[PDB]
Paper text:
The cyanobacterial enzyme CylK assembles the cylindrocyclophane natural products by performing two unusual alkylation reactions, forming new carbon–carbon bonds between aromatic rings and secondary alkyl halide substrates. Two molecules of 1 are then dimerized by an alkyl chloride-utilizing enzyme, CylK, via the formation of two new carbon–carbon (C–C) bonds to construct a paracyclophane ring system. The structure reveals an unprecedented fusion of two protein folds, an N-terminal Ca2+-binding domain and a C-terminal β-propeller domain. We identified the active site of CylK at the interface of its N- and C-terminal domains.
CylK crystallized in the C2221 space group with a single monomer in the asymmetric unit. Phase information was obtained by partial substitution of native Ca2+-binding sites in CylK with Tb3+, followed by collection of X-ray diffraction datasets at the Tb X-ray absorption peak energy. The structure of CylK was solved to 1.68 Å resolution via a combined MR and single-wavelength anomalous diffraction (SAD) approach, with the MR search model generated from a poly-alanine seven-bladed β-propeller. The modified β-roll structure in CylK contains three vertically aligned Ca2+ ions on one side of the core fold. Also, the loops that connect subsequent blades contain unique blade-bridging Ca2+-binding sites, suggesting a shared role for this divalent metal in structural stabilization of both domains of CylK. Cavity 1 is lined by the top face of the β-propeller domain and the N-terminal domain, forming a solvent-accessible tunnel that is ~18 Å deep and 15 Å wide at its largest point. Although 3 was required for CylK crystallization, we could not model the alkyl resorcinol substrate in the resulting structure. Notably, the apo CylK model also contained a positive Fo−Fc electron density peak at the Br1 site. Given the presence of chloride salts in the protein storage buffer, we modeled this site as a chloride ion in the apo model. However, the closest Ca2+ ion is approximately 8 Å from this pocket.
Residue numbers in the entry: 7 to 45, 49 to 392, 413 to 662
C-alpha cells in the first residue's frame, strides 16, 4: 500500500539522518551540506555549521586528518578496495578514476548490533572538483562495481524483525548504463523501492525485509537490468588447485612476499579475520612462513583494535623485516597519531624481536621496505604529500630520514638498495620534481631519486606522458641499475594499446634513462603493489592484473599476469592466470633452482573453495617458461 511505502521512506530517512549526523564530524557535515546546496539531502546532516580548517598547528583539527579517518581514498588505477577495514561506523569509499571493485563491508567480521553505512563514490574524479578547464580526463567515467554481497551472504544484513536500517550501503554516483551492483542470491531475493533519496534495495524473504543499499538520485530500475550481477548462494568452482590457498570468511589479502637464505618463502598482508591468530579488531597485519618444499611452518597476526596491514617485507637472509601503516598503537611506548608508519623485525621462528612506530599526528603511509647487503633496513612512504626514505640498523635504531618532493602531491611507490651504500626511491607526482610536468591539469608523472649512504640526494629524475602515469614498484639489478614498473594512460614506452598499459623503465646509477618498454591489450593492464623482482641472474619479473587477453584468454573479470624480461628489456614470457571472478597478483618473489612465486588476491576459488569474500593465493612458477608447478612439489 501507499502507507507502507510512505512509512519506509520516513524510517530510512530518519535512520540515515540519525547515523550520519551522530558519526560524521561537523567539518565533514559542513562540506557535504555545501555541495548538496549547490546541486535538500543536506537535511540528513543535522550537525552545526563549522569552519573547515587546513592550517591548525594541531594536525587533528585539520580537515585532511578528519577526512582520512572516515575515508578509503583509492588511486587513479582500476582498484580493488585494498585498504578496506571495519574500523568505523560510517566510511566514504572513493574509487576515483578507473574501473574500481568497491567493497566496504567485511562479511567475516563480528558486526552484530553495529551501525554500518558505507558511502560509495565510484568515480568522483579529481577533475570534477578541479575548476581548471580542458583536462585530458574531464567528464571521463569508468564502469565501477559496487559489492553489496557475495555467494555467501548479502552484506549490510541484520536478519531481524526491523527494516534492517542499522547497516546499509549508500551509492552516490551509480550509472545504470555503465556500473554494476553485485548482490548475493538471485533477483527473486530482492525488492526495489522508490524512496525520496532514489532507490532502496531490500532483501526480502518470508520472515521479512532488510535494507541492503540506497542508490542516490536514481529511480525506476529493474532487478532484470544488466547492471545487477547476482552471485547465487554457492561458492564458485575451484580452479588452479596447484596454488596455496589462504582464506577466512573475512577479507584476506597478501600484499608482499620475500625469501630467506635457506629458501623459506614468506607471505603477508592484511586480514579482517582470524588468519594467523585471533582477530584483534578490524583489519590486522599477518605473515606466514613456508619451507622450500611448500610446507607452512607458522603464521603470525598482530595489530590493534584499529587498522593495519603488512605492505612490504624483506629479509637480511635470516630475519624478516615487515613494514606498513596503522591507525592504532603497535609499539607500547608510542603516542599513536592514528595514521602512522611501522617497521618490525621477525626472527625465522616467528618471534617479533622488536617493532617501531612513528607516533606523530602527521598523516603517514608506508608501502615499501628493502634490506641492503650490510643488513641495514630502508623504508619509504609519504606524509601536500611529500616522499620520505628512512634508514634503520638491525636493532631498529633510526640512522636518518630523508624527506623530499614538490609543493604538490608526491607519493612513494618504491625503495631499493644497490650493493654500494646507495638507495633508490620512486613514486608519482602531480608536480615538477625532476622535470617540468607536461600534464596541463596535474596528471601524475613518475619520479626516481638516488640517495647516498648519508641520505643526501645524488639526483632526481622524472618521466611521463601528459596523461596519468603511475609507478607501483622498483628494484635494482646486480650492476646497481634501477628498474621501475607502472601503468600509463599515455604513450610512454610506445603507442598505447588502449586504456591502462604496463611499462618497465631502466635508469643507470648516473641517472641516464636507458629505455622504457610498454605492453598491453586494448583493455586495462597494470602491474600492482609489489610488482617487480630481480633475481641473482638479473632476470626481471613483473606481476599485476588485466581485464584483457594479455598472456592468454581472460578467465573472467580481472585476472593475474606475470612476465619475465632480461636486463635489456626483451620479453622472455608473459603468463595469465585466474578465476572467472576478480583476481590480481600483488607480489612476486624469485627464489633459486628456477622457482618463482607469484601471490595475490581473488574473489573466486583459487587453490580451493573461496572461504568468503576476498581470499589470497600463492602460485609456484617455473622461471624458465612461466609454467605453473604444484606449490607442494
Ligand atoms: Ca581507482
Ligand atoms: Ca572509478
Ligand atoms: Ca563509474
Ligand atoms: Ca541492512
Ligand atoms: Ca586491527
Ligand atoms: Ca601519523
Ligand atoms: Ca609534495
Ligand atoms: Ca604524466
Ligand atoms: Ca591496455
Ligand atoms: Ca579473473
Ligand atoms: Ca576470505
Ligand atoms: Cl592515486
Ligand atoms: Mg582512511
Ligand atoms: Mg618488489
Amino acid at each position: 500500500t501507499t502507507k507502507s511505502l510512505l512509512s519506509a521512506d520516513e524510517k530510512i530517512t530518519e535512520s540515515l539522518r540519525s547515523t550520519l549526523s551522530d558519526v560524521l564530524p561537523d567539518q565533514l557535515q559542513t562540506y557535504i551540506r555545501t555541495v548538496l546546496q549547490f546541486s535538500e539531502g543536506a537535511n540528513l546532516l543535522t550537525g552545526p555549521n563549522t569552519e573547515i580548517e587546513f592550517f591548525s598547528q594541531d594536525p587533528n583539527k585539520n580537515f585532511p586528518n578528519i577526512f582520512a579517518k572516515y575515508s578509503n581514498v583509492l588511486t587513479v588505477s582500476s582498484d580493488p578496495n585494498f585498504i578496506t577495514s571495519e574500523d568505523e561506523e560510517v566510511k566514504i569509499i572513493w574509487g576515483r578514476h578507473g574501473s574500481d571493485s568497491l567493497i566496504g563491508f567485511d562479511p567475516g567480521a563480528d558486526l552484530v548490533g553495529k551501525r554500518r553505512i558505507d558511502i560509495f563514490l565510484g568515480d568522483f574524479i579529481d577533475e570534477q572538483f578541479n575548476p581548471i578547464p580542458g583536462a585530458l580526463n574531464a567528464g571521463k567515467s569508468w564502469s565501477d562495481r559496487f559489492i553489496l554481497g557475495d555467494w555467501q551472504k548479502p552484506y549490510y544484513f541484520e536478519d531481524d524483525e526491523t527494516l534492517g536500517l542499522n547497516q546499509s550501503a549508500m551509492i552516490l554516483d551509480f550509472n545504470p548504463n555503465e556500473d554494476v551492483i553485485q548482490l548475493h542470491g538471485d533477483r527473486q531475493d530482492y525488492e526495489l523501492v522508490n524512496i525520496s533519496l532514489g532507490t532502496a534495495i531490500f532483501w526480502r524473504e518470508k520472515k521479512g525485509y532488510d535494507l541492503i543499499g540506497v542508490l542516490g538520485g536514481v529511480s525506476d530500475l529493474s532487478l532484470k537490468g544488466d547492471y545487477f550481477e547476482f552471485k547465487g548462494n554457492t561458492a564458485p568452482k575451484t580452479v588452479l588447485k596447484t596454488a596455496e590457498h589462504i582464506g577466512t570468511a573475512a577479507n584476506d589479502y597478501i600484499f608482499s612476499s620475500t625469501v630467506d637464505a635457506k629458501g623459506n618463502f614468506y607471505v603477508g598482508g592484511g586480514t579482517g579475520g582470524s588468519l594467523g591468530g585471533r582477530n584483534i579488531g578490524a583489519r590486522d597485519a599477518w605473515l606466514a612462513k613456508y619451507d622450500s618444499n611448500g610446507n607452512q611452518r607458522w603464521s603470525r597476526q598482530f595489530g590493534s583494535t584499529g587498522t593495519e596491514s603488512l605492505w612490504g617485507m624483506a629479509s637480511d637472509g635470516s630475519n624478516i623485516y615487515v613494514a606498513g601503516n596503522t591507525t592504532g598503537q603497535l609499539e607500547n611506548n608510542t603516542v599513536k597519531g592514528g595514521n602512522d608508519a611501522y617497521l618490525a623485525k621477525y626472527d625465522s621462528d616467528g618471534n617479533q624481536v622488536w617493532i617501531k612506530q612513528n607516533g606523530t599526528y602527521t598523516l603517514e603511509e608506508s608501502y615499501k621496505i628493502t634490506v641492503d647487503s650490510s643488513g641495514n633496513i630502508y623504508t619509504a612512504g609519504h606524509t601536500s604529500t611529500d616522499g620520505y626514505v628512512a634508514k634503520f640498523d638491525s636493532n631498529g635504531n633510526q640512522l636518518w630520514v630523508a624527506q623530499f618532493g614538490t609543493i604538490t602531491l608526491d607519493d612513494n611507490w618504491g625503495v631499493a638498495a644497490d650493493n654500494n651504500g646507495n638507495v633508490f626511491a620512486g613514486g608519482n607526482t602531480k608536480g615538477s620534481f625532476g622535470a617540468k610536468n607536461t600534464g596541463t591539469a596535474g596528471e601524475y608523472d613518475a619520479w626516481l631519486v638516488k640517495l647516498n649512504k648519508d641520505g643526501q640526494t645524488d639526483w632526481v629524475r622524472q618521466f611521463g606522458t601528459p596523461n596519468y602515469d603511475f609507478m607501483w614498484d622498483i628494484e635494482t639489478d646486480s650492476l646497481g641499475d634501477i628498474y621501475a614498473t607502472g601503468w600509463t594512460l599515455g604513450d610512454l614506452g610506445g603507442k598505447n594499446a588502449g586504456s591502462y598499459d604496463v611499462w618497465l623503465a631502466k635508469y643507470n646509477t648516473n641517472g641516464n634513462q636507458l629505455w622504457i618498454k610498454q605492453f598491453g591489450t586494448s583493455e586495462d593492464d597494470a602491474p600492482f603493489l609489489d610488482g617487480i623482482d630481480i633475481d641473482a641472474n638479473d632476470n626481471i619479473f613483473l606481476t599485476g592484473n588485466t581485464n584483457g587477453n594479455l598472456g592468454g584468454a581472460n578467465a573472467g573479470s580481472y585476472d593475474a599476469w606475470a612476465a619475465k624480461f632480461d636486463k635489456d628489456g626483451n620479453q622472455l614470457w608473459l603468463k595469465q592466470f585466474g578465476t572467472p571472478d576478480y583476481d590480481t597478483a600483488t607480489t612476486v618473489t624469485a627464489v633459486n633452482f628456477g622457482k618463482l612465486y607469484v601471490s595475490g588476491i581473488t574473489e573466486g576459488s583459487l587453490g580451493t573453495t573461496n572461504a568468503g569474500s576476498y581470499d589470497s593465493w600463492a602460485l609456484k612458477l617455473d622461471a624458465d617458461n612461466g609454467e605453473i608447478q604444484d606449490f607442494n612439489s
